[PDB]
Amino acid sequence: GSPEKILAQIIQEHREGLDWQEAATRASLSLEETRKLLQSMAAAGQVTLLRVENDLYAISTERYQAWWQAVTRALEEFHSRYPLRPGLAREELRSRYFSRLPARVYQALLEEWSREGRLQLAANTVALAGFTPSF
């Protein structure tokens, strides 16, 4: 198939996403070409781009959106069941839905969702934005 189809399949099939350089290598593409294709896939709403430390990851947008829907439901349910607790253990959420991700990528996702106003983070726990303990 064409180089663009090869790259698209690499990213869309990848269950955690991957360093864009790794994707370039797997597709036998230059960085230039990989970047330009990623920019059009991002414009089409197909790929999510995430900096992780000094690396850049390309992730299927469908996968990323499905992660968020799992997280918000789990936290909604947790806050309903246990409204006095400050949040769910970060490591428990990781083990539920993110066990194949590198830990640093999981942390970058939590920090992104917090920045966006979706979450609030403590050192060990995670909660929905605006949640406060009560009875």
Query: Which residues bind to Na ion, rule: CB under 5 A?
Result: 49, 54-55
Choose among Na ion, Cl ion, none what residue 99 binds, the Cβ cut-off being 5 to 8 Å by kind: Cl ion
22 binds Cl ion (CB under 5 A): yes
Distance of alpha carbon 113 from alpha carbon 110, whole angstroms: 5
Instruction: Supply the DSSP symbol for 89.
Output: E
Choose among Na ion, Cl ion, none what residue 81 binds, the Cβ cut-off being 5 to 8 Å by kind: none
Report the residue number, 6 or 68, with the smaller CB distance to Cl ion. Answer: 68
Report the residue number, 109 or 126, with the smaller CB distance to Na ion. Answer: 109
Distance of alpha carbon 24 from alpha carbon 32, whole angstroms: 9
Please report the DSSP string for 121-135 in residue order.
E-SSEEEETT-----
CB of 81 to Na ion, least distance (A): 32
Instruction: Supply the DSSP symbol for 2.
Output: -
